[PDB]
């Protein structure tokens, strides 16, 4: 199991005078931070969200983001004027993964109107191949900012893996927690004329990895349709698995659920 840290920024520029920037951080599947345009601070969502950082460290990290947010939206408005761009959706996805064998990696990807345009590579900003020409002009300006460049490297190479190591420790018990799902069957819409839709709902499990198949005893029905894994408000997950059978094929059929919290005691519901 892996717990990368992904820091996500959503900056929306409706025109030259109206803009919002909002952020959040994820460790693995769990949201640890929330960063609101209304707020003067990034909010720790968990008792362990601060990692092993000192209060004085967190505060200057708060300061860094606070000035980052201000001049980022300053700078975006400049480039939009400079490069004659029409009104704007920017997204940032930055963070890192800790691998105890030195194979530790990090990333800082920026997207414009939903498309990758540039990322941080080694030491400087680098455009992607498919990005428009004009992005080249902006990277010429960005790479003249040696302090922003030195700081981004410190955050990626230094602050981030330090932070992830502290979060893995101070949040150890919640990360390893197991919550058992419940399941229930229901009749879905008639898919055809002589057909009935068997529906197996599975809700309440954590963490995310799960296995749900319709079965006739031990014969896994290849017709099993697994839904998306959808989130509940309490950080568990929900899953719908559907089967299209003929009028009389329903009887004798069972939904099987295997999850890391059950300890081999699968859930099995017979139709």
């Amino acid at each position, epitope marked *: 199991r892996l717990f990368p840290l992904r820091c996500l920024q959503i900056s929306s520029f409706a025109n030259s005078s109206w803009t919002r920037t909002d952020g959040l951080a994820w460790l693995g599947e769990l949201q640890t931070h929330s960063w609101s345009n209304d707020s003067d601070t990034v909010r720790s969502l968990k008792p362990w969200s601060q990692g092993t950082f000192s209060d*004085q*460290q967190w505060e*200057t990290l708060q300061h860094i983001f606070r000035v980052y947010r201000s001049s980022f939206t300053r700078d975006v408005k400049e480039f939009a004027k400079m490069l004659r761009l029409s009104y704007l959706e920017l997204q940032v996805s930055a963070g890192c993964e800790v691998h105890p064998g*030195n194979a530790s990696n990090n990333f800082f990807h920026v997207a414009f109107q939903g498309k990758d345009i540039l990322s941080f590579q080694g030491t400087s900003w680098e455009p992607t191949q498919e990005a428009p020409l004009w992005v080249n002009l902006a990277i010429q300006v960005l790479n003249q900012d040696k*302090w922003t460049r*030195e*700081t981004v*490297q*410190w955050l990626l*190479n*230094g*602050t981030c*893996p*330090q932070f992830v*190591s502290g979060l893995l420790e101070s949040g150890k018990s919640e990360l390893k927690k197991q919550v058992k799902p419940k399941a229930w069957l229901s009749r879905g819409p008639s898919p055809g004329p002589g057909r009935l839709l068997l529906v197996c709902h599975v809700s309440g499990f954590y963490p995310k990895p799960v296995w749900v198949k319709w079965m006739r005893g031990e014969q896994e029905q290849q017709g099993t349709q697994p839904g998306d894994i959808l989130p509940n408000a309490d950080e568990t997950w929900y899953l719908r698995a559907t089967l299209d059978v003929v009028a009389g094929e329903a009887a004798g059929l069972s939904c099987r659920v295997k999850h890391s919290s059950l300890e081999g005691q699968d859930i099995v519901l017979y139709q």
Partner: T-cell receptor
Amino acid sequence: GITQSPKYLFRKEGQNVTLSCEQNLNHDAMYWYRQDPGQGLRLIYYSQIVNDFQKGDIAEGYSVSREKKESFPLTVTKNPTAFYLCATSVGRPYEQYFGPGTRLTVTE
Amino acid sequence: AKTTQPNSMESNEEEPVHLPCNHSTISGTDYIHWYRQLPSQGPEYVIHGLTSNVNNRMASLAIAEDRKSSTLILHRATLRDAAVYYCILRDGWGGTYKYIFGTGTRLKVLA
């Protein structure tokens, strides 16, 4: 960058003296170090920013002032003779820059 | 967190020199700085790194894999490189401005 006039400074015991440090570049933090022959640098006084200054491990006997951001004067008033080095600091990655140093000898 | 260096070191001219430094309690956000003080002069910045090896024109910094030790490497020492070399940690957060130096390594370069 950093100026320390003059290179050499001589004074008789029990007389007070103030060595100058003038920097032209725009650095907030300033430092005074003291070095004895064949010895390492020992920090006297540092000023993270104007009107502020904190005492290093051997400020006993020394006084300092930070009224402008381009100037940081050290004043001596037990073993005053030594090599006195002034430094400035930039932001991350926080490299230090040093004056050419002033030589101070105090005679009985 | 402090650093440790041998007191003195000798090396022949026109050979590379590996100057060692130990910093076992270093943290992920600590930079490693190296300074050089020629006789009668003020220290001079030489190089700094965080997590990757660094190459300037005359000197490189090799950082161990656990970041617990490091090496300043003069690519080719000449007589003029006789100096005291200081290996320092600099907190990347920028909290304490109590910037202090150890004793460093006095390098002698032999003809």
